Swiss-Prot record, chain A:
InterPro entries: Ribosomal_uS8 (IPR000630), Ribosomal_uS8_CS (IPR047863), Ribosomal_uS8_sf (IPR035987). The keyword Ribosomal protein applies. Component of the small ribosomal subunit. Part of the small subunit (SSU) processome, first precursor of the small eukaryotic ribosomal subunit. During the assembly of the SSU processome in the nucleolus, many ribosome biogenesis factors, an RNA chaperone and ribosomal proteins associate with the nascent pre-rRNA and work in concert to generate RNA folding, modifications, rearrangements and cleavage as well as targeted degradation of pre-ribosomal RNA by the RNA exosome. Required for proper erythropoiesis. GO terms for cellular component: cytosolic ribosome; nucleolus; ribonucleoprotein complex. This is Small ribosomal subunit protein uS8. The modification N6-succinyllysine is found at K87. The keyword NAD does not apply. It is found in: Cytoplasm; Nucleus, Nucleolus. GO terms for biological process: translation. Belongs to the universal ribosomal protein uS8 family. Signal peptide: none annotated.
Swiss-Prot record, chain C:
InterPro entries: Ribosomal_eS7, Ribosomal_eS7_CS. It is found in: Cytoplasm, Cytoskeleton, Microtubule organizing center, Centrosome; Cytoplasm; Nucleus, Nucleolus. This is Small ribosomal subunit protein eS7. Belongs to the eukaryotic ribosomal protein eS7 family. It comes from Oryctolagus cuniculus. GO terms for cellular component: 90S preribosome; centrosome; cytosolic ribosome; cytosolic small ribosomal subunit; nucleolus; small-subunit processome. There is a cross-link at K66, K70 (Glycyl lysine isopeptide (Lys-Gly) (interchain with G-Cter in SUMO2)). The lineage of its organism: Eukaryota, Metazoa, Chordata, Craniata, Vertebrata. It comes from the Eukaryota. Component of the small ribosomal subunit. Part of the small subunit (SSU) processome, composed of more than 70 proteins and the RNA chaperone small nucleolar RNA (snoRNA) U3. Binds IPO9 with high affinity. Interacts with NEK6. Interacts with DESI2. Interacts with IPO5, IPO7 and KPNB1; these interactions may be involved in RPS7 nuclear import for the assembly of ribosomal subunits.
Curated annotation (Swiss-Prot), chain D:
The modification N-acetylalanine is found at A2. PANTHER family: 40S RIBOSOMAL PROTEIN S11 FAMILY MEMBER (PTHR10744), SMALL RIBOSOMAL SUBUNIT PROTEIN US17 (PTHR10744:SF52). It comes from Oryctolagus cuniculus (Rabbit). One of its GO terms (biological process) is translation. A lipid is attached at C60 (S-palmitoyl cysteine). This is Small ribosomal subunit protein uS17. The modification N6-acetyllysine is found at K38, K45, K58. The modification Phosphoserine is found at S67, S110.
Curated annotation (Swiss-Prot), chain E:
GO terms for cellular component: cytosolic ribosome; cytosolic small ribosomal subunit; nucleolus. The keyword Ribonucleoprotein applies. This is Small ribosomal subunit protein uS15. The keyword Ligase does not apply. Belongs to the universal ribosomal protein uS15 family. HAMAP family: Ribosomal_uS15_A (MF_01343_A). GO terms for molecular function: small ribosomal subunit rRNA binding; structural constituent of ribosome. The gene is RPS13. Component of the small ribosomal subunit. The ribosome is a large ribonucleoprotein complex responsible for the synthesis of proteins in the cell. Part of the small subunit (SSU) processome, first precursor of the small eukaryotic ribosomal subunit. During the assembly of the SSU processome in the nucleolus, many ribosome biogenesis factors, an RNA chaperone and ribosomal proteins associate with the nascent pre-rRNA and work in concert to generate RNA folding, modifications, rearrangements and cleavage as well as targeted degradation of pre-ribosomal RNA by the RNA exosome. It is found in: Cytoplasm; Nucleus, Nucleolus. GO terms for biological process: translation. The modification Phosphoserine is found at S29. It comes from Oryctolagus cuniculus (Rabbit).
Length: 129, 84, 190, 158, 150
RNA sequence: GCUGCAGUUAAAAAGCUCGUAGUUGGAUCUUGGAGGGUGCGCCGUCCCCGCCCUGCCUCCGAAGCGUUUACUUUGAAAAAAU
């Protein structure tokens, strides 16, 4: 069955972009999916998206450009300690310079750069570049 | 799958061909009707697929028998849908 | 006067007074009285539409609404005609309760009802703003600029009562929530 | 109630004396037993039962000679087999880096339970406080019964 | 998909959006609640009441014409019976299989199947019990089950 | 071989399923304008912050005082040698 819903949305995306696709319909969506789709959006890795309202759990249409090499999800959502964030981005990001680790902290779902600036930390959601 | 559809606005025709659960936003593919039988003049509302015998208001009549799917309406009968 | 029907914890006035009087004007009549009489209103608020025809929003107790729904179209027709130059409609005051924190404190206040959530309430507002149509579906669009727009699908039949309104519903909605709303038409399953 | 006094020794609170005496009504006097109590501190309300009660329990934190100092813990009641004592199960998380997931682990803790508390029933979450060695096993004493009919799986009433 | 087989089959209602309606539906809460209570008097199950209501008389969902699910209506009238219906028909089914197996000790398929049914029951009861509906300590026993379902 | 292994044929998926512990669990309840750090020759560039385009009650402090946690964050407490 389902343990997580994010992992499906992310994968669906990745296969869309790999095909050469410019849109996807993910299902079923969640506040966390929105928040993650949103961080991606702010940065350029996707275009605009749209939450369609079935009387159920939702369905999202993402319009994607093609700046996206990969958006992954980290499971389980490990706790990170401010100097485990430095260790994570190195593990899974292309160059020190770019790509984001996106985690969930007490003060919001955020990319790790925003994390560093706020100076808060938490549990790791996923990534992209 | 040629990198071309508007997943958000898909066509009504190919939306209408797809499984009820596969529809963009879901919805059913079943309906209701009003049914006649001259002898009476009033009209019983009936569900397109039905399982139950449906009998009319008074006359022990009939008014379809069930099946795998849509109820088979019985011989000399008439039916407007229908609403919204 | 002001005392009866503009109440709900504040007397007040002006517009509330005018509209109330209008209701009385309607009250003289037949079946176009007695049916209304029971109905009562908490307050009226006025907010405009961009070129400048204003919309008038009326507030209802919520147990009342079924009856208001009962008339609505006929009444709105009268209020638009007598009070012309305004878009009239009907919204029910709904309570909304804050999500508890934590240290909000929390003396575990009695649960609360989904039928009290801010989102549910807003949904109710959308439902209330349009009337006999029905909201067929909804979508949310994330704009490049961190913005969000809600596309609210509408039925088809009998819509006309609302067609001219649409812009006000958008503006009215904004005044309440601060979110942006847009409207559309469908399709007919085949 | 049940006659306390039950044993062979006369149960009494130390240095809380009597003296009944002559004349009429009461008779002697009506309460017939002066009772001494104290609040544990840490804001633990001394339940009415303690003040209202006849029971003796030296071990009681409110009525008895024991002080509560040290760790204040909470746990779930696993057993109430023994008279005036209970066993609580304490769940805790063990962290294992060497690769990192820690695994639930638990410990049972024997703790004295004053007759002032009742309905001490297994399943109840309870707040116990550290104390002087009461018995070879027991380090703690039940200070507060957290409760709840909740955990619904049944419907509690009042 | 599926619990005690390899079946995949997606199959469902597909419930309607439209928030309100039917609109061509007049009647009233009054009407169908009476209807429901009278049918439940006759011994009918909520599944059964929902079906017969659906097809014979206009009720798309009883929920919509009345803010309450059929079972809740029954329980509030005072028509709820001792164990939930799904659990009933499971217990009844394991009974009929058990009676057939006592007759035909040579049928290994049946013995397998009885197990499956029984496991489904025990888990369901575990769920109902967790949720107060059944008294904690509720159990289904062959011995007593026969006597229970009727 | 956590990070970071392999198991159709190379060494390796139990004949199959039920199933307790254990692990694992759907959606859904709040919405430019200047302050301070270091570069470049009075000007600005680039973070960070309260904002625009949310602890209740008791009745400022105090107190009541926490729904439980885990988490994470900021402090103290943290032997020297190393």
């Amino acid at each position: 069955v389902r343990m997580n819903v994010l992992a499906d949305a992310l994968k669906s995306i990745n296969n869309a972009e790999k095909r050469g696709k410019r849109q996807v319909l993910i299902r079923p969506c969640s506040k966390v999916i929105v928040r993650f789709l949103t961080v991606m959006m702010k940065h350029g890795y996707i275009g605009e998206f749209e939450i369609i309202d079935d009387h159920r759990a939702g369905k999202i249409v993402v319009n994607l450009t093609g700046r996206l090499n990969k958006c992954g999800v980290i499971s389980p959502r490990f706790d990170v300690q401010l100097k485990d964030l430095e260790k994570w981005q190195n593990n899974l990001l292309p160059s020190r310079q770019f790509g984001f680790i996106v985690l969930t902290t007490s003060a919001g779902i955020m990319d790790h750069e925003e994390a560093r600036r706020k100076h808060t930390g938490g549990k790791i959601l996923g990534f992209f570049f | 799958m040629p990198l071309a559809k508007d997943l958000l606005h898909p066509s009504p025709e190919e939306e209408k061909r797809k499984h009820k659960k596969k529809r963009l936003v879901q919805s059913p593919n079943s309906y209701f009707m009003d049914v006649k039988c001259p002898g009476c003049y009033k009209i019983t509302t009936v569900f397109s697929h039905a399982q139950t015998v449906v009998l009319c208001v008074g006359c022990s009549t009939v008014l379809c028998q069930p099946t795998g799917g849509k109820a088979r309406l019985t011989e000399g009968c008439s039916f407007r849908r229908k609403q919204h | 006067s002001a005392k009866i029907v503009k109440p709900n914890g504040e007397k007040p006035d002006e517009f509330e007074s005018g509209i109330s009087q209008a209701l009385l004007e309607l009250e003289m009549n037949s079946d176009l009285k007695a049916q209304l009489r029971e109905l009562n209103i908490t307050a009226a608020k006025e907010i405009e539409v961009g070129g400048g025809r204003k919309a008038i929003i009326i507030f209802v107790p919520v147990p009342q609404l079924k009856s208001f729904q009962k008339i609505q179209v006929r009444l709105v027709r009268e209020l638009e005609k007598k009070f012309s130059g305004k878009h009239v409609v009907f919204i029910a005051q709904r309570r909304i309760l804050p999500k508890p924190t934590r240290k909000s404190r929390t003396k575990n206040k009695q649960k609360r009802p989904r039928s009290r959530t801010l989102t549910a309430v807003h949904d109710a507002i959308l439902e209330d703003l349009v009337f006999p149509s029905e909201i067929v579906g909804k979508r949310i669009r994330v704009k490049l600029d961190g913005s969000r727009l809600i596309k609210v699908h509408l039925d088809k039949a009998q819509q006309n009562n609302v067609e001219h309104k649409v812009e006000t519903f958008s503006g009215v909605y904004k005044k309440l929530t601060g979110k942006d709303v847009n409207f559309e038409f469908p399709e007919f399953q085949l | 109630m049940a006659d306390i006094q039950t044993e062979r020794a006369y149960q009494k609170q130390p240095t809380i004396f009597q003296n009944k005496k002559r004349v009429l009504l009461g008779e002697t006097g009506k309460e017939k037993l002066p009772r001494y109590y104290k609040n544990i501190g840490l804001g633990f309300k001394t339940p009415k039962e303690a003040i209202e009660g006849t029971y003796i329990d030296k071990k009681c934190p409110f009525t008895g000679n024991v002080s509560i100092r040290g760790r204040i813990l909470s746990g779930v009641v696993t057993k109430m087999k023994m008279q005036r004592t209970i066993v609580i199960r304490r769940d805790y998380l063990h962290y294992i880096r060497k690769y990192n997931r820690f695994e639930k682990r638990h410990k049972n803790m024997s703790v004295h339970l004053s007759p002032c508390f009742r309905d001490v029933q297994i399943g109840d979450i309870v707040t116990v406080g550290e104390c002087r060695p009461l018995s070879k096993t027991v380090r703690f004493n039940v200070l507060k019964v957290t409760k709840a009919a909740g955990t619904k799986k049944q419907f509690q009433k009042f | 998909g599926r619990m005690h087989a390899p079946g995949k089959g997606l199959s469902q209602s597909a419930l309607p959006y439209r928030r309100s309606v039917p609109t061509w539906l007049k009647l009233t809460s009054d009407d169908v609640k009476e209807q429901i209570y009278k049918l439940a008097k006759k011994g009918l199950t909520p599944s059964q009441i929902g079906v017969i209501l659906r097809d014979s008389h206009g009720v798309a969902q009883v929920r919509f014409v009345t803010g309450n699910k059929i079972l809740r209506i029954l329980k509030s009238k005072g028509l709820a019976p001792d164990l939930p219906e799904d659990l009933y028909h499971l217990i009844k089914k394991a009974v009929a299989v058990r009676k057939h197996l006592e007759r035909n000790r040579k049928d290994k398929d049946a013995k397998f199947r009885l197990i499956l049914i029984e496991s489904r029951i025990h888990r369901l009861a575990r769920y109902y019990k967790t949720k107060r509906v059944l008294p904690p300590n509720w159990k289904y026993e062959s011995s007593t089950a026969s006597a229970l379902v009727a």
